[PDB]
């Protein structure tokens, strides 16, 4: 979770997310201002909206 | 606090995208209504001018001989105890005209000269300590000038310079940048050269202190300068603190030290806390340089306080030639001295000796009013420097 | 301008008329200190700062019980009449030691110190919270804890963490601040500290790195350290000294336990001693998890194997491996680490920097 | 007094000045007539070598621990006004008291009464006096018997 | 005149003084150690002359000087710096106690755990006179020492203090109380209302303060 | 007792024998000792550090010792250690002659002494010998030789080297003025005179501060000589005249 930064057109492809910040494994609070995830299309959400009720489903990768 | 400029640095479109236009026009409409909004109400209600009337009344409430004093304590809001000019304490009443925010316990206060009260805070004169270590800009030494050391320049770049220019890297892997760097090697290897090289291409307030000034005269005025050093660094946003010749806090004994070794140790125990204590750290990176890494307490170097230990060896033969070329670049030689012949003068020349040869060579050419150094000058230069 | 110009809208909110209503009716007073309460009915003896010692009684509205000997009180500037009691003076350098912002670390970032954490909560995090449990039995909970171990083991983390959850006021002390120039005022900072704490019903003091002011009594016949020794005695006397210390619960962690006076290490002052030893195999396998969470991993990483490759590795040396293993990925330009990256990390932070280290020369505590 | 440190402290050069004033008014430009001074000290070695110079402190008496003859004389004075009974022997106490400077000898008398007061006795005997001579000697080993003479 | 109390770190020195301040209807001026020490020249003397004038100004008084090391360190000859500011305070204490005035109504009690460092002048007979030795409990004081601090919480009838007083050797009095105090905190861990002998014995180790060392390859 | 033990045979954290390094540092304060190898002989030139109007002239040399009929050595460092090592060298040579009935080759002698030094710097707990020796001699195997030794126990064969005060300057000067395989004894003596002149910054050579020894073969027998005042003065005069002619 972190603030939202817009890169509609920038000289360099800067990452959408500023920093990972907190990544506590245990259950924790989720901030309202969510943004785009990282790269590699890993664990990519399907909802694409973060409405506080998004569900995650595991997939088959590198069998 | 607030920044006068940078009203909205939304340069994300970075082009002729219409999004730039919409926001700009928004303020224009608001400005138009405000114009007649202020002047109109300023006629039928001629109580406060806000430009000449506002300032005028407060000045009368103030006094012509405004006083200067030290705020000693903060009793309940609108009330405070301010130390008078000489030695008296007054239970003055704080006036709302003051910002009521800069009232730090001990900075400064302006008081009326007859009914003493708080009338206004005063910005504190830049303490002489800050000016002492506030290096402005490295005079001439660049980062490609250093030459030689290559695998050792990446560590310093990757600890004290990368996290400030490309934070994303230590932003997506969730790894905090290595805390500090300690440079150790024989006497003269570029330890300080690399130290001032980083000051060149940096955007943070560089502070430098040698290990010798960390040892002071009176007891207690030891691990109190260490507190001041890290208090200035925090106050000045990102900053790289460089401690040079750290091996002078227990390697050299001075009679001025009222307390002996026992006092110097407590300076280290305070420096230990300032690098990793249970207080917050912020953004302050410590670069320590020394020529004897084996003569200091092995807790100041504990991982967490200083993480990356960079080793500076005596120059390699290949690097020796590079050292001569860089130092002799702006010199009108006499196409009779061969650099390669002087590379092997002594078994191990530090590199600072190389500059000494190339600097005494010129002084040996000035004596004859000649603007070209010959093999004779270098031959006598290589003997007057590393022999006696 | 540049002096005190505040929000101009707030000035009118200041009600300049009221300010004039306050810059005349409200008489400015002068601080003083009472020495005696000469009996007869009033007749209080006063001592202004640097004018004289006058004799004053009262004005109308200060109850006689509102005033007591040695109490800060303001006085009139013309007739010298007490008008309002004033707070006692606490040295500003001692009042800055109070922590106002809790450190951002909890009791889940220290790993392997399960027994240490539990034993550090029944003396600093249970007597205060749920204080009725001990009442239904005769128990004065231990008051004081010494945390000792090799450098970079977690002495401060377990202390920085306790301040994150403690409800009572937390007071810092570094052990070098208590060293001051002139004889005397190195015990004032140790007398004022407890006076401030006693003003708080629940208070904790963390005498971090108590080795600069906690040495052993040593008489060389050559006037060895004496100011530090005097300061230590004041600390020793204010924990069990013919005066109930109150609710103050000390917490001091020392890097060199085998240097303390054999009077600061007895029950009553520093009651319970908690040992912070180097993490065991199960431990350092857990420190790796608590420091490699918010980082990209191959998921399938043999963290147990990495734990067993650094047997006597302090907690700090494990974070430097994690913080350095990902460093080897920033250089290769990759974004996801790998086990081979960590193995090269262990080869550099554990076996390549072992020349300096601190563990080998400290586990003897000398 | 003191030895006039070099590299002293802030509030120690001031005490030095006071010594330099008491020092100069002893033997200075105006000789002091018909005013004699007596000084005492338990450590006449820390004194500055200007206060000990002949002319300022001319004679240096050396009051010492009492000898065998003196020790007996000491006991009578402080052991005199005691409700004694029997052949109180002062010769016994003296031999067993070596190094008893000037007060434990009076302590011997006062301590003896303490033993006598126990047992509800308005009755002091020789055994009580002896019983106090050892109790004082035992409490003397923890001192540091040093001479510390001037030089 | 005077009662010096010396001994190992914790044996009961301040307990007797605090106790003697309870069974006595007289002023009990309570001094300290570091406290008579003040930065300014002569400020230490004021607090000693004033601390004895006040006691004399009042009825029979006892003036207790705890932690006498801070103001009674052995005098020390030296050039090139030193410490005589504290020495004057001691020198004013010496003369005030017994010098040029036979004051006989203020009683002085002193507490110390290091008599080797004291100035020989402070251990005369005219000054503090009855130099009491406070020794560690031998084998029975440790039994009463625990019953005193244990008679407030709970005790099963089958709790042999004699064996407890035997397994605890070289224990000063203060450590003995920690045994009883820790006997409860460790009975609270296993939720219960009654202390048992194995709780005391198990808590003896926690107060002994001996690190775990995998002491399991012996025997 | 552990407390009073100086621990003179330990490895420093950087793997350096500190006592050996300090002993070497001691040699830097001794007299200058120089040795040049020629096609027809070897020579040793030494700085007579002791200089006083009251010292008497005794023995055939002050720092140049004779070890065999075909060997000699010069010592720089502590004089007493030099005497001990010279006695040991003589004993070793005589033992070899008794065993084999042939003079000891120089390499064997230097190796034996260096073995003694190494033993002292490895085990025993004693301080190392603070002396460096220059050897010159002839043998039937390699002809004329010039050897060097150090407290550590390291020896190397040299054609021209210097040990003592201002050794680095002497080595540099020799490196520039040494013609390998084309030097007679006269040229070697001239070079030694120049080196001693420049290395002893204190005034100029007075012919009393220099002790020069020569090793040469004549009629099948080795001859070791110590130059007298006359020949040393003649060399000084020739060097001064040559320098004047150059300028
Ligand atoms: N490797 C090098 N490359 C370039 N310049 C060098 C190098 N080593 C030394 N120098 C030169 O040596 C000069 C004088 O020594 P220098 O400031 O470099 O010392 P240092 O290596 O930082 O040592 P120390 O910590 O002992 O002061 C410098 O101006 C620098 O230009
Ligand atoms: N058990 C642990 N779990 C996680 N991190 C730990 C642990 N022990 C130490 N650390 C790490 O140690 C660092 C801080 O060390 P800290 O100052 O607490 O150690 P210390 O040995 O008590 O210090 P010192 O002796 O220098 O005062 C942090 O980066 C923290 O992550
Ligand atoms: N004989 C005893 N009986 C009970 N408690 C004792 C005894 N001796 C010491 N203590 C304990 O020691 C503590 C007082 O320590 P004290 O002896 O005053 O320290 P110091 O000797 O350094 O002044 C008290 O809490 C008391 O419970
Ligand atoms: Mg440098
Ligand atoms: Mg710490
Ligand atoms: Mg304990
Ligand atoms: Mg005088």
DSSP code per residue over B157-169: IIIIIHHHH-TTH
What gap in Å lies between CA B296 and CA B290, rounded to an integer?
Answer: 10
Contact C232, C261 (CB under 8 A): yes
Q: How far is A14 from chain B (nearest CA, A)?
A: 8
With an 8 Å Cβ cutoff, are C139 and E9 in contact?
A: no
Does residue C153 have its Cβ closer than 6 Å to ligand 2?
Answer: yes
At B17 the three-state DSSP class reads coil
What's the length of chain F?
A: 247
**Exposure of F69 by Cβ count < 10 A (0-12 exposed, 13-18 middle, 19+ buried)?**
middle
Looking at beta carbons, which pairs linking B108-111 to residues 24 or more positions away fall under 8 Å? B108/B68, B108/B69, B108/B70, B108/B71, B109/B68, B109/B69, B109/B70, B109/B71, B109/B80, B109/B82, B110/B66, B110/B67, B110/B68, B110/B69, B110/C3, B110/C4, B111/B66, B111/B67, B111/B68, B111/B69, B111/B82
The separation between the first and the last C-alpha atoms of chain A, rounded to the nearest angstrom, is 31
At F149 the three-state DSSP class reads strand
Contact E108, E1 (CB under 8 A): yes
Cβ neighbours, 10 Å, residue C253: 25
Q: List ligand 1's pocket residues with C-beta within 6 A.
A: B 146-149, 187-193, 289, 291, 315, 323, 351-352, 355
Distant-in-sequence, close-in-space partners of A5: CB < 8 Å, separation ≥ 6: A14, A16, A18, A35
Q: Per the structure block, which two tokens stand in for F203?
A: 């005034």
Q: What are phi and psi of F138, to 5 degrees?
A: -125, 145
Contact B174, C295 (CB under 8 A): yes
**Taking the mean position of all CA atoms in its chain, how far away is CA F244?**
31
- Token look-up 């920033």 returns C330
Q: Per the structure block, which two tokens stand in for E152?
A: 């407030």
Distant-in-sequence, close-in-space partners of C201: CB < 8 Å, separation ≥ 6: C168, C247
Q: Give the DSSP H or E segment for F64.
A: strand F64-68
- For residue C174, how far is its CA from the centre of ligand 6 (angstroms)? 22
Contact B122, B173 (CB under 8 A): no
Residue F31 half-sphere exposure, CB side, CA atoms within 13 Å?
25
At B62 the three-state DSSP class reads coil
Q: What are phi and psi of D55, to 5 degrees?
A: 115, -35
What gap in Å lies between CA B112 and CA F64, rounded to an integer?
Answer: 93
Which of D100, D104, D144, D149 to mutate: most E Cβ within 10 Å? D144
What gap in Å lies between CA C191 and CA C171, rounded to an integer?
Answer: 14
DSSP track, chain D:
-----SS--GGGHHHHHHHHHHHHTTSSSS---S-------S-TTSS-TTTSSTTTS----------HHHHHHHHHHHHSSS-B-S---HHHHHHH-SS--SSHHHHHHHHHHHHHHTTT-S-B-HHHHHHHHHHHHHTTTTS--------
Which of C142, C233, C268 to mutate to test ligand 3, by most ligand atoms within 8 A of the CB atom? C268
Q: Per the structure block, which two tokens stand in for E39?
A: 């930065």
Q: Per the structure block, which two tokens stand in for F93?
A: 């040579």
Question: For the stretch B125-144, what's the b/e string if a residue is b when 16 or more beta carbons lie within 10 angstroms of its beta carbon?
Answer: eeeeeeeebeeeebeeeebe
At A16 the three-state DSSP class reads coil
What angle is formed at CA B369 by the lines to CA B363 and CA B373, rounded to 5 degrees? 55
Distant-in-sequence, close-in-space partners of F247: CB < 8 Å, separation ≥ 6: none
This structure's resolution (angstroms)?
A: 2.9
Q: Per the structure block, which two tokens stand in for B333?
A: 């030689």
At B354 the three-state DSSP class reads helix
Q: What are phi and psi of C324, to 5 degrees?
A: -100, -30
Q: Per the structure block, which two tokens stand in for A39?
A: 């790269």
What gap in Å lies between CA C155 and CA B341, rounded to an integer?
Answer: 58
Domains, in order of start, for chain F:
1-247 (3.60.20.10)
- 3-class secondary structure for chain C? CCCCCCCHHHHHHCCHHHHHHHCCCCCCEEEEEEEECCCCCCCEEEEECCCCCCEECCCCCCCHHHCCCCCEEEECCCCCCEEEEECCCCCHHHHCCECCCCCCCCCCCCCCCHHHHHHCCCCCCCCCCCCCCCCCCCCCCCCCEEEECCCCCCHHHHHHHHHHHCCCEEEEECCCCCCCCCCCCCCHHHHHHHHHHHCCCCEEEEECCCCCCCCCCCCCCCCCCCHHHHHHHHHHHCCCCCCCCCCEEEEEEECCCCCCCCCCCECCECCEEEECCCCCHHHHHHHHHHHCCCCCCCCCCCHHHHHHCCCCCCHHHHHHHHHHHCHHHHHHCCCCCCHHHHHHHHHHHCCCCCCCCCCCCCCCCC
Q: What are phi and psi of F215, to 5 degrees?
A: -125, 120
Nearest to B81 by CA among C34, C3, C74, C48: C74
Contact E6, E136 (CB under 8 A): no
Contact B61, C15 (CB under 8 A): no
What gap in Å lies between CA B257 and CA B269, rounded to an integer?
Answer: 17
The DSSP call for residue E27 is: B
The DSSP call for residue B125 is: P
Contact F126, F20 (CB under 8 A): no
Contact C80, C57 (CB under 8 A): no
The DSSP call for residue B98 is: S
Contact C143, C245 (CB under 8 A): yes
What gap in Å lies between CA B93 and CA C18, rounded to an integer?
Answer: 13
- Token look-up 């650094």 returns C310
What angle is formed at CA E141 by the lines to CA E140 and CA E147, rounded to 5 degrees? 95
Nearest to F170 by CA among F144, F201, F131, F202: F201
DSSP track, F12-58:
-TTS--HHHHHHHHHHTTS--EEEEEETTEEEEEEE-----SS----
CA diameter of chain A: 38
Residue D107 annotated as binding site? no
**Taking the mean position of all CA atoms in its chain, how far away is CA D88?**
26
What angle is formed at CA E159 by the lines to CA E153 and CA E162, rounded to 5 degrees? 115
What gap in Å lies between CA B118 and CA C218, rounded to an integer?
Answer: 52
Cβ neighbours, 10 Å, residue A63: 3
The DSSP call for residue B145 is: S
Beta E130-133 vs E3-6: how paired, if at all? parallel
Q: Give the DSSP H or E segment for E148.
A: helix E141-150
Within 8 A of D9 by CB-CB distance, chain E residues are 81, 85
Radius of gyration (C-alpha) of chain D in whole angstroms: 22
At B43 the three-state DSSP class reads helix
What gap in Å lies between CA E33 and CA E25, rounded to an integer?
Answer: 25
Q: Categorise residue E11: left if φ over 0, alpha if ψ from -120 to 50, beta otherwise.
A: alpha
Contact F195, F173 (CB under 8 A): yes
With an 8 Å Cβ cutoff, are C294 and A39 in contact?
A: no
Q: How far is C306 from chain B (nearest CA, A)?
A: 18
What gap in Å lies between CA B360 and CA B368, rounded to an integer?
Answer: 13
Which of E38, E72, E84 to mutate: most D Cβ within 10 Å? E84
**C 273-302 → A contacts, CB under 8 A:** 293-295
Chain C residue closest in CA terms to E213: C277
What gap in Å lies between CA C112 and CA C285, rounded to an integer?
Answer: 9
**Exposure of B106 by Cβ count < 10 A (0-12 exposed, 13-18 middle, 19+ buried)?**
middle
The separation between the first and the last C-alpha atoms of chain E, rounded to the nearest angstrom, is 58
Looking at the CA of residue B190, tell me the nearest atom of ligand 1.
21
Q: Give the DSSP H or E segment for F232.
A: helix F229-246
What gap in Å lies between CA C125 and CA C164, rounded to an integer?
Answer: 11
Nearest to F25 by CA among F15, F35, F34, F16: F16
Nearest to E187 by CA among E156, E212, E164, E210: E156
Residue C271 half-sphere exposure, CB side, CA atoms within 13 Å?
26
Beta C248-254 vs C145-148: how paired, if at all? parallel
Sign of the four-CA dihedral C245, C249, C255, C256 = positive
Which residues are bridge partners to F27 per DSSP?
none
H-assigned helices in chain B: 19-44, 53-61, 128-132, 153-156, 162-165, 169-172, 191-200, 225-235, 261-275, 317-327, 339-343, 352-366, 375-384
Which of B329, B351, B354 to mutate to test ligand 1, by most ligand atoms within 8 A of the CB atom? B351
What angle is formed at CA B239 by the lines to CA B238 and CA B244, rounded to 5 degrees? 165
What gap in Å lies between CA F27 and CA F29, rounded to an integer?
Answer: 5
Contact C365, C275 (CB under 8 A): no
- 3-class secondary structure for F160-208? EEEECCCHHHHHHHHHHHCCCCCCCHHHHHHHHHHHHHHHCCCCCCCCC
Question: For the stretch D64-97, what's the b/e string if a residue is b when 16 or more beta carbons lie within 10 angstroms of its beta carbon?
Answer: eebeeeebbebbeebbeeeebeeebeeeebbeeb
């Amino acid at each position: 979770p972190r603030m939202l930064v817009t890169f509609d057109e920038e000289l360099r492809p800067l990452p959408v997310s500023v920093r990972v910040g907190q990544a506590v494994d245990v259950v924790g609070q989720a901030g309202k201002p969510k943004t785009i995830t990282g790269f590699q299309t890993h664990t990519t959400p399907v909802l694409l909206a973060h409405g506080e009720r998004a569900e995650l489903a595991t997939e088959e990768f590198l069998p | 606090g607030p920044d006068a400029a940078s009203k909205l640095p939304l340069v994300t479109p970075h082009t002729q995208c219409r999004l730039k236009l919409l926001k700009l026009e928004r303020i224009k409409d608001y400005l138009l209504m405000e114009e007649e909004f202020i002047r109109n109400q300023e006629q039928m209600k001629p109580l406060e001018e806000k430009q000449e009337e506002e300032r005028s009344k407060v000045d009368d409430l103030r006094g012509t001989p405004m006083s200067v004093g030290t705020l000693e304590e903060i009793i309940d809001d609108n009330h405070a105890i301010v130390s008078t000019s000489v030695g008296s304490e007054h239970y003055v009443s704080i006036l709302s005209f003051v910002d009521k925010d800069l009232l730090e316990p001990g900075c400064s206060v302006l008081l009326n000269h007859k009914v003493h009260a708080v009338i206004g805070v005063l910005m504190d004169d830049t303490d002489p300590l800050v000016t002492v270590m506030k290096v402005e800009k490295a005079p001439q030494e660049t980062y490609a000038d250093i030459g030689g050391l290559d695998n050792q320049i990446q560590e310093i770049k990757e600890s004290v310079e990368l996290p400030l220019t490309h934070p994303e890297y230590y932003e997506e892997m969730g790894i905090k940048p290595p805390k500090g760097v300690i440079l150790y090697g024989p006497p003269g290897t570029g330890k300080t050269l690399l130290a001032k090289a980083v000051a060149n291409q940096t955007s943070a307030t560089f502070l430098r202190v040698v290990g010798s000034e960390l040892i002071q005269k009176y007891l207690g005025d030891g691990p109190k300068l260490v507190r001041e050093l890290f208090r200035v660094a925090e106050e000045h946003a990102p900053s790289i603190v460089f401690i040079d010749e750290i091996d002078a806090i227990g390697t050299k004994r001075y009679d001025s030290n009222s307390g002996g070794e026992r006092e110097i140790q407590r300076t280290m125990l305070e420096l230990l806390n300032q690098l990793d204590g249970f207080d917050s750290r912020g953004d302050v990176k410590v670069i320590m340089a020394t020529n004897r890494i084996e003569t200091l307490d092995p807790a100041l170097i504990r991982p967490g306080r200083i993480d990356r230990k960079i080793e500076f060896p005596l120059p390699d033969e290949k690097t020796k030639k590079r050292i001569f070329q860089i130092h002799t670049s702006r010199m009108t030689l006499a196409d009779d001295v061969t650099l390669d012949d002087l590379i092997m003068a002594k078994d191990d020349l530090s590199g600072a000796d190389i500059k000494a040869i190339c600097t005494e060579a010129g002084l040996m050419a000035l004596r004859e009013r000649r603007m070209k150094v010959t093999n004779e000058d270098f031959k006598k230069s290589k003997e007057n420097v590393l022999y006696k | 301008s540049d002096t005190g110009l505040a929000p101009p809208a707030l000035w009118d909110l200041a009600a300049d008329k009221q300010t004039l209503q306050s810059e005349q009716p409200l008489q400015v007073a002068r601080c003083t200190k009472i020495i005696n309460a000469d009996s007869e009915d009033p007749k209080y003896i006063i001592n202004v700062k640097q004018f004289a010692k006058f004799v004053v009684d009262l004005s109308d509205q200060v109850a006689p019980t509102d005033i007591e000997e040695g109490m800060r009180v303001g006085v009139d500037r013309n007739k010298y009449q007490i008008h309002i009691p004033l707070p006692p003076k606490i040295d500003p350098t001692v009042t800055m030691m109070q922590v106002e912002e809790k450190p951002d670390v909890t009791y889940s970032d220290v790993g392997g110190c399960k027994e240490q954490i539990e034993k550090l909560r029944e003396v600093v995090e249970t007597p205060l919270l749920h204080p009725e449990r001990f009442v239904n039995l005769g128990i004065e909970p231990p008051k004081g804890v010494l945390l000792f171990g090799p450098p970079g083991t977690g002495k401060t983390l377990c202390a920085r963490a306790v301040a994150n959850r403690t409800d009572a006021c937390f007071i810092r002390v570094i052990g070098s601040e208590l060293v001051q120039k002139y004889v005397g005022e190195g015990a004032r900072m140790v007398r004022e500290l407890f006076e401030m704490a006693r003003t708080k019903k629940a208070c904790l003091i963390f005498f971090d790195e108590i080795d600069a002011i906690g040495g052993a009594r040593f008489d060389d016949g050559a006037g060895g350290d004496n100011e530090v020794q005097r300061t230590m005695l004041e600390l020793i006397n204010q924990l069990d000294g013919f005066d109930p210390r109150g609710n103050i619960k000390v917490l001091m962690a020392t890097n060199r336990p085998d240097t303390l006076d054999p009077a600061l290490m007895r029950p009553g002052r520093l009651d319970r001693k908690i040992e912070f030893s180097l993490p065991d195999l199960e431990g350092r396998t857990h420190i790796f998890k608590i420091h490699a969470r918010s980082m990209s991993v191959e998921r399938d990483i043999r963290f147990e194997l990495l734990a067993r490759l650094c047997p006597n590795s302090t907690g700090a040396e494990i974070r430097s491996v994690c913080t350095e293993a990902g460093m080897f990925a920033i250089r290769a330009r990759r974004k996801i680490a790998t086990e081979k990256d960590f193995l090269e990390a262990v080869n550099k932070v554990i076996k390549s920097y072992a020349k300096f280290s601190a563990t080998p020369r400290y586990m003897t505590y000398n | 007094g003191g030895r006039r440190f070099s590299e002293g402290t802030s509030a120690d050069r001031e005490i030095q000045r006071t010594l330099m004033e008491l020092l100069n008014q002893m033997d200075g430009f105006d000789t002091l007539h018909r005013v004699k001074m007596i000084m005492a000290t338990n450590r006449p070695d820390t004194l500055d070598p200007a206060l000990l110079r002949p002319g300022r402190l001319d004679r240096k008496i050396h009051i010492d621990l009492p000898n065998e003859q003196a020790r007996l004389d000491i006991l009578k004075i402080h052991a005199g006004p005691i409700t004694k009974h029997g052949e109180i022997d002062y010769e016994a106490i003296v031999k067993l008291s070596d190094g008893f400077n000037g007060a434990d000898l009076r302590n011997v008398c006062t301590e003896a009464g303490m033993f006598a007061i126990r047992a509800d006795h308005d009755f002091v005997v020789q055994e009580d006096f002896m019983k106090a001579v050892r109790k004082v000697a035992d409490s003397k080993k923890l001192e540091s018997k040093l001479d510390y003479k001037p030089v | 005149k005077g009662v010096l109390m010396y001994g190992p770190p914790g044996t009961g020195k301040t307990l007797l003084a605090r106790a003697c301040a309870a069974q006595t209807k007289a002023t009990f001026l309570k001094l300290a150690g570091p406290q008579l020490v003040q930065m300014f020249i002569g400020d230490g003397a004021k607090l000693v002359r004033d601390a004895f004038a006040l006691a004399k100004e009042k009825a029979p008084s006892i003036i207790f000087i705890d932690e006498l090391d801070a103001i009674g360190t052995k005098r020390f000859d030296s050039e090139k710096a030193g410490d005589r500011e504290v020495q004057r305070t001691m020198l004013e204490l010496l003369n005030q106690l017994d010098g040029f005035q036979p004051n006989t109504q203020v009683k002085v009690i002193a507490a110390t755990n290091r008599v080797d460092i004291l100035d020989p002048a402070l251990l005369r007979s005219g000054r503090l006179d009855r130099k009491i030795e406070f020794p560690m409990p031998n084998e029975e004081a440790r039994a009463r020492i625990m019953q005193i601090h244990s008679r407030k919480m709970n005790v099963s009838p089958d709790v042999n203090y004699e064996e407890l007083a035997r397994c605890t050797d070289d224990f000063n009095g203060a450590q003995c109380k920690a045994v009883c105090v820790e006997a409860g905190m460790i009975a609270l861990r296993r939720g219960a209302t009654e202390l048992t002998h194995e709780d005391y014995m198990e808590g003896i180790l926690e107060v002994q303060a001996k690190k775990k060392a995998n002491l399991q390859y012996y025997a | 007792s552990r407390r009073y033990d100086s621990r003179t045979t330990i490895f420093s954290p950087e793997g350096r024998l500190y006592q050996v390094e300090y002993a070497m540092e001691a040699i830097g304060h001794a007299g200058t000792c120089l040795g040049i190898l020629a096609n027809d002989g070897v020579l040793l030139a030494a700085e007579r550090r002791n200089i006083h109007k009251l010292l008497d002239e005794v023995f055939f040399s002050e720092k140049i010792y004779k070890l065999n009929e075909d060997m000699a050595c010069s010592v720089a460092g502590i004089t007493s250690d030099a005497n001990v090592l010279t006695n040991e060298l003589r004993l070793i040579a005589q033992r070899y002659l008794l065993q084999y009935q042939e003079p000891i080759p120089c390499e064997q002698l230097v190796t034996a002494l260096c073995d003694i030094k190494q033993a002292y710097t490895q085990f025993g707990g004693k301080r190392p010998f603070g002396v460096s020796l220059l050897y010159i001699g002839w043998d039937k195997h390699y002809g004329f030789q010039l050897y060097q030794s150090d407290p550590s126990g390291n020896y190397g064969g040299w054609k021209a080297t210097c040990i003592g005060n201002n050794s680095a300057a002497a080595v540099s000067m020799l490196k520039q003025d040494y013609k390998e395989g084309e030097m007679t004894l006269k040229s070697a003596l001239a070079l030694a005179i120049k080196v001693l002149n420049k290395t002893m910054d204190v005034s100029k050579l007075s012919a009393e501060k220099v002790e020069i020894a020569t090793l040469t073969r004549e009629n099948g027998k080795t001859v070791i000589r110590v130059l007298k005042q006359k020949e040393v003065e003649q060399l000084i005069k020739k060097h001064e005249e040559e320098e004047a002619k150059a300028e």
